[PDB]
Amino acid sequence: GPISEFMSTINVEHTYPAVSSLIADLKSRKVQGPFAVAVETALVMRQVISQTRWSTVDQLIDTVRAVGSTLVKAQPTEFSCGNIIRRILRLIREEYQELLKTADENEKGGMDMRAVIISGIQDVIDELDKINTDIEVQSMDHLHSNEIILTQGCSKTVEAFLRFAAKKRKFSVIVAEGFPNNQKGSHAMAKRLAQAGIDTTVISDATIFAIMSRVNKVILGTHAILGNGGLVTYSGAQLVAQAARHHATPVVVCSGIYKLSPVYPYDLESIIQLSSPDKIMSFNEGDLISRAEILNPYYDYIPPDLVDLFITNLGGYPPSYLYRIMNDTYDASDTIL
Amino acid sequence: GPISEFMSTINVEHTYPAVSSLIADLKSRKVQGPFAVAVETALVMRQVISQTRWSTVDQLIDTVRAVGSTLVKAQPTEFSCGNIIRRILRLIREEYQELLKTADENEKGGMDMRAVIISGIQDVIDELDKINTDIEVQSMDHLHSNEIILTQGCSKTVEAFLRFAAKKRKFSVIVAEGFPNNQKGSHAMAKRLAQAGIDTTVISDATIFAIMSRVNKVILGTHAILGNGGLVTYSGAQLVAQAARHHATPVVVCSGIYKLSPVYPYDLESIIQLSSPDKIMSFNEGDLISRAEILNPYYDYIPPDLVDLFITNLGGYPPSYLYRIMNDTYDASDTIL
Amino acid sequence: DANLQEKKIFEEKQVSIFSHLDWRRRRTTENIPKDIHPAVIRLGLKLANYKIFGSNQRCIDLLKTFKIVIQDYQTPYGTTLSRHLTTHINSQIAYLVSTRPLSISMGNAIRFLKLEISVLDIDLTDDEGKELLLEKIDSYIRDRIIIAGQVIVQAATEKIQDGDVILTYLHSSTVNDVLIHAKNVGKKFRVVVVDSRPEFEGRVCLKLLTEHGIECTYVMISALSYIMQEVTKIFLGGHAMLSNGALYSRAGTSLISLLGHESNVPVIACCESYKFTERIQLDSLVYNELAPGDQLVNMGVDDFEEKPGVLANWKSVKNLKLLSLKYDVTPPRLITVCVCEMGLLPSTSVPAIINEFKQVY
Amino acid sequence: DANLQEKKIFEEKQVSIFSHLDWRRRRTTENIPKDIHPAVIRLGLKLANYKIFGSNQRCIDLLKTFKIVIQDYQTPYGTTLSRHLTTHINSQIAYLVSTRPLSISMGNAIRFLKLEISVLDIDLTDDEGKELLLEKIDSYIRDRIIIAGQVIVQAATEKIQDGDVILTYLHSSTVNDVLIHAKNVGKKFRVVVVDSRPEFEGRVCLKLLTEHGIECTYVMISALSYIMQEVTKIFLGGHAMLSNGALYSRAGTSLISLLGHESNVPVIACCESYKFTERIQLDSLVYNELAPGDQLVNMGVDDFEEKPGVLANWKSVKNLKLLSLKYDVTPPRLITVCVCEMGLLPSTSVPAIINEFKQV
Known about the structure:
- Chain D: Keywords: Cytoplasm, Initiation factor, Phosphoprotein, Protein biosynthesis.
- Chain D: Belongs to the eIF-2B alpha/beta/delta subunits family.
- Chain D: This is Translation initiation factor eIF2B subunit delta.
- The structure is cut from a larger assembly and holds 2 copies of chain A (337 residues) and 2 copies of chain C.
- Chain A has 337 residues and is of the alpha/beta class.
- Chain A has helices at residues 9-15, 17-27, 34-49, 57-73, 80-104, 114-128, 156-166, 183-195, 208-211, 238-245, 286-291, 322-327, and strands spanning 148-152, 172-176, 200-203, 217-220, 224-225, 231-234, 251-254, 274-275, 293-294, 296-297, 299-302, 309-312, 315-317.
- Chain A has a 7-stranded mixed beta sheet.
- In chain A, strand 12 and strand 13 form a beta hairpin.
- In chain A, helix 3 (34-49) packs across helix 5 and helix 5 (80-104) packs across helix 6 (114-128).
- The longest helix of chain A is centred in the N-terminal third of the chain and has 25 residues, at 80-104.
- In chain C, helix 7 (173-184) links the parallel strand 1 (164-169) and strand 2.
- At the A-D interface, helix 8, strand 3, helix 9, helix 10 and helix 11 of A face helix 8, strand 3, helix 9, helix 10 and strand 8 of D.
C-alpha cells in the first residue's frame, strides 16, 4: 500500500513537496548514510504532518504509512528511513490511546494534536544529536589501560567511543582500513586517535588474522541491525568477526538505536549493495575490465551469533535481548511498509 | 611371560639381586617419579647384562623381556620403566643385526657384545643427564618479552625451560600450585624463577579460567606420554587445558623422550592411581572421614587433540608426529611386555 | 585527600592486569568517624572477618541493621526526614564498603532503599515515615529473597531424579537448602562436593549434608576430570547473574561449568532475582574483588593453623606476588538453566526480568 | 658495529608486539664492501626492489648466481677449495640478507649447498670440485623445484572437476601454472581472484589468466564474505609449510582459508617439498618479515603514483605508526591437503618428508 495509490505524483509535489524531493535525493544517493537519512527523514515528515489536513486518526496512520512505503522503495537498504517512520506511527497511536483514554477518564475527536506530534517528532530528532554523547560514556566500563583494541573503517560512533576513554586511560587500538570504500575516513580516524593519546596502528585489511592473536577486544560500528540481530555493516567486517571467533576474542558493537530494524534478512543478495568497480581496479586497465567480472560491494552481513555485546544509547545489551528493544520502540504491524 | 616362569625367586634373588631390590623399591614407592625410576632401571639392567651368562641372542632377549614384564608388574603406571627396557631390546637387535652383517660382509650370536651393550646402556644414561640442557635451549624460539605464560606445579624440565629465557628476555609467568600433591614444589619453583627475573604470579588452582583471557601460552610438564599422544600429567592439569581450549590459547608441552610410551590408554581407570586422602582432608575431622568418600587422584589425563606443540630433547614436534619417534626409538614387538 | 587518593587510584592502571582491582581494606575500628551506628560496626567487622558469609545473609543482616539505623535516626528540627537521610545512610555505606566491597546483592538493596526514601510522601511525619519503610524492607526480605528461596528449592528439586549424582561447589546456602529438601521429600540421590583452596568452603557443605544423612563425595577441584564421570547434574548458586546470561560466582565456578559441559552434564544455576545486574562482563578481571594473598601461604590443609611456607616473604621479594581472585564469570553457553523465582529461565532472559521490575513507574 | 648493534637489536624487545621484527634493509650500494661478486649485487637489488618475486624464482636465481660465484671463485692455492669457500659464500649472504631477509626457499637451499661443500673429497682438484658442485646445483634446481612443480601441477589438476569455480589469491606462480595447465587439458571451470592492498599482487594473476582465456572475477579481500558463496575450491601456493601442518604464506592467506572452512569449501595447498621446514610457529608474529609502512600511505588503486596520503607524516607524528606484515601462519584445521611432489599429503605429514631427506 504505497502513496501513489492515494495521491497523484503531481499533487504530491504540491501537497508535500519535500517528500518528492527526498525520494530524488534518496535514490540518487544525494543523502546517504543512516544518520543523514534518519534526520532528514524525520524533518520531512515534520512538514508532512504540518501540511496534511484530516479528521480521524485512521486517516494519518494510513496516510503516513503510504508515503513511507514509497519512501522505503526509494532506497530500502538505508534502513534508518522506515525506522523513523515506524517509530512515528507508534508515536501517534500512543498519543492517541493516551488521549482517547484521558478524555474517557475525564467523565462522570480533536485532530489538533498535530503540534503534539511535531513536539513528539522534534523529540526524536533531538535524540539523534544525543546518540554518541550518551554512548561515549560507556567506555570506561570496557576499555582499560594497556589493552589492545581492533576496529575497522571510519565510524564516528566508535571513534567518540574510544576518545572518551583516552581522556584518562591510555591504551592501544588497531585500525583496519575499510578497503576499498572506507579507506579515506579510516586513515583520518587513526590520525585523530593519535592526537588523543592512543597507540594507534594502521594495517592493511589482510593483516587482521595476524594481529588478532594478541588482541583483547574488537569494537565495530555497523550500518544497521536487522530483525534477527544480524548486522549490515560496511565492507570487510566479517573478516574481523570470523578472525575474532577463531581466537575467542570478544566482539563488541557500538551502534545507535535508530539503525535497529525489524526487517528480517530473508535473502542477503537483496541486501548488499554494489558500488562502482572504479574503487577496485582503474579504468585504464582496459584489457582487464573487459575480460573479467569486477565487483565492489560496500556492505557485509555478519550473523548475530557472533556479537557478544551491544553498546547502545540505552545501554549494554546482549543480542538475545534486542527484540525487547524493538517491541518497546516499534509496532509489529509496521514491520512491512 | 614374566620372569617367575623362568627363574625361581631365590635364583632371581641370587643371580640379579638389584632386580629384586628394585621391585620392592618400586612397589613401595621408594623410587618414585619417571626420571629416578628411569636411571635406576637402566642401572639395574646394566648389572643384569654384566651378570647373565648366555650363548644366543634369543635366550638373552627372552631374559630381558622377562624381567621387564615383571619390573612393570611391580608398579606399572610409572611407564618410564618399560620405555627404558624397550629401548634396550631394540638396541640389542640392532647391534646384533649390524654385527651379524659385518660378519657376512667380512666373509666376502657371540656374547662379546656384553661390554658393548654396557657401552650402549651408559649412552642411554648419559643421554638422561642431558634432557633439560637439551630442552632449555628451544625457549628463545617460543618465549618473548612481555608475554604471559601459565604453568602448573613443580616440573624441573619446564623450570629450566623458562629460566634459560629470563637470563636475556624479560617476561611474566603465572603458576598454579598443583594442589594437593604438587603444592610444595610449585611454590618453591615460583620463588626460584622469581629470583631469575620473572614477574611471577602464584594462583590457587581455581583461578585458571579467571586469567586465561589475557594469557599468551600455557606450558606444561607431563608425567608420561602414551601411545596415542595423550598425556598422563600430574594432578589438576586438565583445568589449564580445557580453559586454554576455551580461549584459543595454545598449549605446549616440554617433556623428555623417556616418558614417551606406546601403551595404549585402553581404560583410564587403570591409569590414574590415587594417593592418600590425607592430602585434602585432615584425619581430625573424624565425623566426615567416616560419613564421606575422600579421594585424591595423583595423575590427570589430557587427550592429545589438546596439545599444540611438543618440546623434546630431539626438537619441537607436533603430536601427530609422535609415532615416528616411537617407531624410531622402540620396537613394535615390545609394546606388550 | 580523596582526589589525592583518586590520583593514586589512577596510577594503579599499569602493566599488571590486576592493577585496577582495589586492595584497600579496613579490618579495624581505628579512626572510625563518629556518625557510625554501633550495629553497623558489628556488621563491618563480620564482613571483613567472616568467610562463610553467603551473599544472601549479608543482604538480610544489612537490611535488619539498616532498620535499627533508621529507627534510631533523628532528623534535625529544621528539615524533614526525607531530606538529609540518605546523607546519613551514605555516610554508613562509605564505611561498610571500606571493610569489604559491596556484594551485588547488597548493592541493589541500597539502590532500592535509596529510592523509596525519595518517593516517600513528604506530607507524613517521622514516626509515619520510619514505620513505613521498615515494612518495605521487611517486605523486601519477604518477597525478594526468603520466599524466592522457597520457590527456587521447590522448583529446583522438581528436576532432581532418583538415581542422580549431584555436584555442588563451595557451599551455597541456597544449593544446600535444596539438597536438604530433596532429602526430606524422599528423592534418592547422592552428592559430589567440589572444594578448593584457600579457605576450603566445601567442608562446611560436606558437614551440613552429612549431618542430614546424604551420601557425599569430597574432592578438590584438581580432581574435576576424575570425578565428573560419575556426575549427572551440576548445581550452582551464584553471587549474581549478568545481563548477558553469564553467571558471577566464586572462583572455580567457571571450570565446574566448563568441565561439565565437556562431559555432557547440565549446569543448573540457582540464583534469586535481586541478584540480577544491568551490567555485563567480557572477562573475569574488569570487575572483581580480591582476597588477601597471604591466605595461600600457609600451604597446609588448613588456614588458621599457623604453619608457614616458602612464600611468607612474598610481600618483600621483588618479581613475586601472590593473588587470589574471589569471583569469575562463566559464559552463558555453559549455563543451561537459571532458576529464578519466576521459574526455570534461560540465563539470557535476565535483562528482561530486570526490566520487568522497572515497571515501578 | 655488530657488537654494539646486537645490543640495539635486543633492546627492541618491548611493548610493541612487532618490536622484534627486524626492519633494517640495504636498498642501495652505498658503502658496499668488495667481497661481493657483481651478479650477487644485481640480485641484491632485485631482492629489494622487485615485488613480484616468486619464492621459487628467488631460489632459482640465487643458485644460478651462486654458480657464477663458484665458477669465478679463485681459491687461495695456499689452501684448498673446501676450506675458505663457505667463508666466501657466507660473506655473500650477509650482504644478500641485508637487502631482504632470506626466504625459506632460499635458506634450505643455502643450508644444503653448505653441506655438499663440507663433504666432497680433497683428492679432487679445484676445477674438479667446481664442476661437481655446478652439477649438484643444476640437479637441485630440476629435481626439487622444476620437476616437483610439474608433478604438483598434474596432481592438482586431477582434483579439478568440470563445473568448478576455484579461488586463488595474490599471484602464486605455482597455482597459476596449474590453472594455465588446467585450461589446456580442457577442464571447464572459472576462477575467482582475491587481491588485497598494498601492492595489488593479484592484478597480475588476473592479467596472466585473462591472457590465457580464463573466466575470472576480481574482488578485494574485503569482499570475501560476499564472493565465497560462489566458490567451490580454494588453491593456495605457500611460501612454506611448517612442521605442525601450518601454511606459511602471505597476508590474507589465513582469512582465505578461514572463510572457506566456514563455507565448507576446501583449502588445497600447493607447495614444493624443499619449502618445508622444521620450524614451527604458534602465532603469525614470532617469525615474519616487514614491509615499508609508507606503501600504505598511497590511497587509491595504484602503487607508486601521486597519492599524498593523509598519513605521509606518520614517521613524524607521535603515537601513529603504520605497519604491514607480509606473511602469516594459518593453522592446519583450515588447510585440508598439501599437494607436494610426493603426492597429495595431509598437511600434518610434513616433518616425515623432512626426515625422509635427512637420511643422508
